[PDB]
Structure formats: C-alpha cells, structure tokens
Amino acid sequence: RTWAETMGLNTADTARLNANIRYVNTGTAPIYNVLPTTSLVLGKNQTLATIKAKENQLSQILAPNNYYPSKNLAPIALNAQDDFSSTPITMNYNQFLELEKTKQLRLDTDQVYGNIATYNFENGRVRVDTGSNWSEVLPQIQETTAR
Amino acid sequence: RTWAETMGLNTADTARLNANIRYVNTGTAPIYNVLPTTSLVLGKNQTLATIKAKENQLSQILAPNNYYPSKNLAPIALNAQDDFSSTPITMNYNQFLELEKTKQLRLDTDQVYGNIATYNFENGRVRVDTGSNWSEVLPQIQETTARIIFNGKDLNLVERRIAAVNPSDPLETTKPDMTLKEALKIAFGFNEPNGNLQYQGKDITEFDFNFDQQTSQNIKNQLAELNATNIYTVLDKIKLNAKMNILIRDKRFHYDRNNIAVGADESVVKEAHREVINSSTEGLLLNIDKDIRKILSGYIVEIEDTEGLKEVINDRYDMLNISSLRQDGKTFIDFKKYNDKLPLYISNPNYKVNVYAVTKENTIINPSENGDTSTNGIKKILIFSKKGYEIG
Amino acid sequence: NVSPEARHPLVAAYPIVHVDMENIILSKNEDQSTQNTDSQTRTISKNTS
Amino acid sequence: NVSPEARHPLVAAYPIVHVDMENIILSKNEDQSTQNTDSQTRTISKNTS
C-alpha cells in the first residue's frame, strides 16, 4: 500500500486578487460611462498593479450623491488586467508573505474617465457625446473659480 | 500487478459556474439589444464576479410583460467573463467549500444597457438608434414626474409615472396642473360613473394612501390650506409635484416590508371560499379567492368523532401540497394524492369533516425548535365545518 | 409596443428590466487518472563457494 | 440631474468621483494531488545445490 501527497507552487504567481469596489459621486453634475483608474498599493508605496476599469466595471450614470451599485446591492468585482478581462491580477511570493503578515493593502484613485450629456435644442432630448470627457472641462473649472 | 489512482486540484480554480437567467420587462415601453450588467454574490456581500452580458446572452427586443427567453423555453446560460466568451467563471477553494456547505448564492442586477427605437416620418418605419440608450432617458423621467404604485389588479405592483409640476424650475412650470384624481383616471383606468372615483368593482375609499416622508410633508401642508381632513373627499384638489412617491394598496390585507400580500386579517378569509359544486371522498371541489390563493399554503384534513377531538393525517409540511388548480375556475382539494390512493378515514356520516387553513403570515417551512414538525405551529381560522355525508 | 395607457402625453413610457436566476450549475474542476502495471522478472544466479 | 445649487450661472457643475474598496478576496494558487497504490508480487524460486 502507498499514500502520496503533493503540493506545488510557483514563486511569481502565488496568489491572485479580487477587489470589491464601489463608486461615489459627491459632486454637482452627473458623469456618464465612468471608468476609474485605480492602483493597488501594498505596504507604504509599493504598487502591485494599475488597472483601468474594464467593460464589466463601467457605470452608465453616476448622478450626484449616488453610488454604483446602490447601497442595497453588493459591490462589483475587479479581477482583471487584460483589456478583455482574461488575465488575473497576481502577486509573487514575498508580497503574499508580507500581506498575510501585516495586512496592508489599499486602493488609490488616480483619474476618472467619463462623458458629458448635453442638451439638444432640436428635439429636447439629452444625448451623451462620446468624444468629450470631463478631463477637458475640470482643469478649466479649477483655474477660473474659487473653492 | 500494480494499480494506482490520482486526484489533482487547484486551490484558485477549483470550480466553475453557470447561471441560468431570464429577463423580465414590466414597464410601458420596449427596450432593444438588452445587455444587463449583473453580479454573482456569495454569502452576505462577497462578490465573485461582475459580468456584463456578452453577445450570446443578448436579447433583441423585450416588449412589456414579456420574458426573454420566452416562458415556454428554457433559460439562457451565462458562463463567460472574457469579452469573447472564451474564459469561464471560476471559484477558489474556500468559496467552493462555503457554497457547498451553506448554499447561498444570488444574482444582483446593477444596470441594463439597451437602445431606443423611434418613428421615422419618411417611410413610417421604426429605426433603432445605436447611439442612444435608455440610461440617458430614465434619469430625466425620474426627476420630473410623480410615482404611483398600485396593487388593486390581482395584487402586483404596477408602477406608473405622471408628469407633474416642479415649482423651482422654469421649463417644468409649463406643464398642465396635475391633480391626484386625474392622475388616477389616466394612469390606471379609474372611472367615475356616478360621481364617485371607482376602480372596476371597488371604491377609492377601499384603498389607502401610504406616502413617503417628503410627500406626506407636502400632503399635510396641502390639506392645511384646503381646510379638509379626509383625503378621500378632496382628491380633485391635491396638486401633484415632481419627485413624489405615492403608494396605494388594498385595504383588505396586510403586507410585509417588501409590500407583498403575505396575509390578510381574519374576517375576509371565509367570505369567498364557500361555493361548492362537486363533493366526494375523492376530492373537495371548493372555490378560492384569487387574492387569498396567493397567501394560503395548503389545506390539511382532520377527522372528528361524536364527542369532538382531532385526528390530523397530514402532520408534515410536505403534505401541504394538496391544492389543484384546474381550468374550470375552481380548486379540487383531493384526499388520496398524499395517501397513496387509499381513501380518507371516514366510517360514519356523524363523523364530520373539518379542514383548518393558514396564511403565509402564519406558516412555517423549516423545522421547529425541538419536535414540532406537526401542525401545532399552524395558526387556524375556522373555514370548514360540515358533516361527512354532506360532502361524501 | 408602447402600452396603451402610456399614449397620454402626461403618462411616461419607460422600460423596467430585471434579471432573475433560476439555476446555478457549479462544475468541480478536478482531474483524475488510473494506472495498471504488470511486470515479470527472471532471476538466474550461479553461486560457487 | 444637475443639483439646484448649480443652476445659477456663477456656480460650477462638476462631478467628484471617488472609488473606495470594501473587500480584498485573495486566492492562493497551489495544487494538491493524492495517490494510492496496490501491488501484488508472486515469486516462485528454486535453489539447486
């Protein structure tokens, strides 16, 4: 009789990640097709990844003082690095040991893409223009106003 | 002579998933090329994945009160996370052990993509505009109208919206003045044939008007200046406004927090269960009210002697499946369907028959504390008391 | 398909979609194999002492 | 959706989006594998001296 028992590993791909995130708009005007860029920081300022939101993590409207998804629904999952969500977010062995020892991993927010929806005088409707984001607008608000 | 046997694993990819879903449209307009973002939640709020639907799970038109895929067909499969449906939805070891232990898994609907289709004056054809979607239209409906939910037609939430006036905006001060009586007359079909606002059979005083916080703060300030006290008399003077919520229910039942009829009060249960045509030891052909049908779980037979006692055959909740729902507008409560086609325990006409009922406010489904898998935790209102030869 | 009580200019017409799940088919990703070995040995040994 | 403080011409209307994380679910990549074995030997020798 025999009994074997084997445990492999790979010291550059030891763990995968899945963050549960949620968006808030505390501003004054809504933003359509939201796509934040968020980076996962381990320790003080060691960065594991920088992920733009893929198509699975896109919010279609984010009206002011609203969440995505709403506070009754569970958060969305971010587990992809590929453009087509077919590649997980990994970490090597030392990062896994440090994360299990000290438990420090936070989420920064570098920038946020998203479109404006302007009026249409012809038929009263409001149509999202997909060729203009708020990053052409917000630096012009930040320089002619007072906070 | 050697014989070996192996069983590998991977503690990051130890299971896959496949969700069978179906779409419902309960609005008043159709939506084209539907693609719902939706997420699989394990436990309380531990989200495994969020998947916007791919092209295999894409509806093409979802008319109001229709299902995709239709109700005679089987649901569609969601088994992809790649943008080209080449990558499955995985699950690690801890999540798999926990799901196989506790069996908790739901599916939230975060948002829905979908186009709009418009009339074209050249040839009259209807064109679907792929640059537009309903996510630019619903936030403009929601900030300028007033919601009236209603469940007087077969006890389901029929949500409409009526364009009312917002007094702190100049473009919305141009719509006509919308009262509550006109809103009920054009949104749901309430009519006044004798100067009284009725539904098909009922009266408006047979309903009750639960508001929101800010809406009730508006209604009380409206009834102060009116010098009236009853809402049911001055329906044709109550102005509506924007971002109002009004909830109109049936006065005959009680409801949970989720506003579903889960039980009535005790009087109205017996008033519509009494017209009988067929009667035998095989089955009880009663009639059941459609509202009280939605709260009753099942009927439980009893046997009583000359003195008066109890003899409950079905002291088990999986013998509460006694109901039949035929095409002739009645029920047929049988007696041998959960007795292996052996009849009732009736030996004498003086032995009377008795069935005690229970609504969903008063049922139990899981086991009890110590040993009451029987009918001791079943609250009963006296419906059925007649002799055994008057039923057969 | 705009339902007829929405045709009034004051009654808004809009869709309300939601998805509801009816099955969940979890497929355990485990791999297994067997083996069958039948050997034969012919020891021939001379021994002078 | 532009909240009514911004409908004055001198007040700017802009969004302030900010992502907060509520959970990290990390999955350790590893692979167990067990193996059982039987074996039945039948040796029939013969020593001639």
Short mmCIF file of C-alpha atoms in Angstrom, two decimals, chain B residues 1-8 13-18 20-29 36 64 75 96 99 109 134 138 141 159-163, chain C residues 1-6 8-39:
data_model
loop_
_atom_site.label_atom_id
_atom_site.label_comp_id
_atom_site.label_asym_id
_atom_site.label_seq_id
_atom_site.Cartn_x
_atom_site.Cartn_y
_atom_site.Cartn_z
CA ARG B 1 0.40 -6.34 -10.56
CA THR B 2 0.23 -2.65 -9.67
CA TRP B 3 -2.76 -0.29 -9.58
CA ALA B 4 -2.53 3.47 -8.99
CA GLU B 5 -5.07 6.28 -8.73
CA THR B 6 -4.64 10.07 -8.65
CA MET B 7 -6.85 13.11 -7.95
CA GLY B 8 -5.37 16.57 -8.55
CA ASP B 13 -9.67 27.31 -9.84
CA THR B 14 -11.44 24.53 -8.02
CA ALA B 15 -14.89 25.08 -9.51
CA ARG B 16 -16.65 26.77 -12.38
CA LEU B 17 -20.05 28.40 -12.61
CA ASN B 18 -23.01 28.55 -14.97
CA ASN B 20 -29.37 30.19 -15.89
CA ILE B 21 -31.06 33.58 -16.13
CA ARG B 22 -34.18 35.14 -17.63
CA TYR B 23 -35.14 38.77 -18.29
CA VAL B 24 -38.49 40.41 -17.49
CA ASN B 25 -39.88 43.73 -18.73
CA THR B 26 -42.61 45.20 -16.55
CA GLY B 27 -42.63 48.75 -17.90
CA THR B 28 -44.64 50.54 -20.56
CA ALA B 29 -42.14 50.67 -23.44
CA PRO B 36 -27.60 43.68 -18.27
CA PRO B 64 -43.55 44.99 -21.90
CA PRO B 75 -33.32 29.93 -19.67
CA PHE B 96 -16.41 26.35 -3.00
CA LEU B 99 -21.09 27.36 -1.04
CA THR B 109 -28.92 43.42 -11.39
CA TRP B 134 -32.27 54.37 -22.07
CA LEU B 138 -34.75 57.37 -17.26
CA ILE B 141 -38.18 60.83 -16.18
CA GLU B 159 -45.66 51.27 -11.26
CA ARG B 160 -46.53 54.29 -13.40
CA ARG B 161 -45.31 57.88 -13.57
CA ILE B 162 -47.33 61.02 -14.28
CA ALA B 163 -45.74 64.29 -15.42
CA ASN C 1 -45.33 48.16 -28.23
CA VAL C 2 -45.73 51.32 -26.15
CA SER C 3 -48.55 50.09 -23.93
CA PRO C 4 -51.82 51.97 -24.43
CA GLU C 5 -52.14 53.68 -21.07
CA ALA C 6 -48.80 55.37 -21.79
CA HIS C 8 -51.37 60.02 -22.99
CA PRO C 9 -48.84 62.94 -23.27
CA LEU C 10 -48.62 63.12 -19.46
CA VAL C 11 -48.01 59.42 -18.72
CA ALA C 12 -44.36 58.48 -19.13
CA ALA C 13 -43.35 55.39 -21.10
CA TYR C 14 -40.24 53.55 -19.98
CA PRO C 15 -38.93 50.01 -19.52
CA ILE C 16 -38.15 48.27 -16.22
CA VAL C 17 -35.88 45.29 -16.80
CA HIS C 18 -34.58 42.92 -14.18
CA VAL C 19 -32.83 39.56 -14.35
CA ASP C 20 -33.74 36.63 -12.13
CA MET C 21 -31.72 33.46 -11.73
CA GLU C 22 -33.30 30.03 -11.83
CA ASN C 23 -30.40 27.58 -11.67
CA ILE C 24 -26.75 27.53 -10.72
CA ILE C 25 -24.58 24.77 -12.13
CA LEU C 26 -21.24 24.51 -10.35
CA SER C 27 -18.77 22.16 -12.03
CA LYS C 28 -15.88 20.95 -9.90
CA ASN C 29 -12.59 21.21 -11.78
CA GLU C 30 -10.81 18.08 -10.61
CA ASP C 31 -8.72 15.71 -12.71
CA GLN C 32 -8.17 12.02 -12.08
CA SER C 33 -6.33 9.08 -13.61
CA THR C 34 -5.63 5.38 -13.08
CA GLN C 35 -2.72 3.05 -13.83
CA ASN C 36 -2.17 -0.67 -14.37
CA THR C 37 1.28 -2.25 -14.33
CA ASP C 38 2.07 -5.96 -14.82
CA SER C 39 5.76 -6.87 -14.68
#
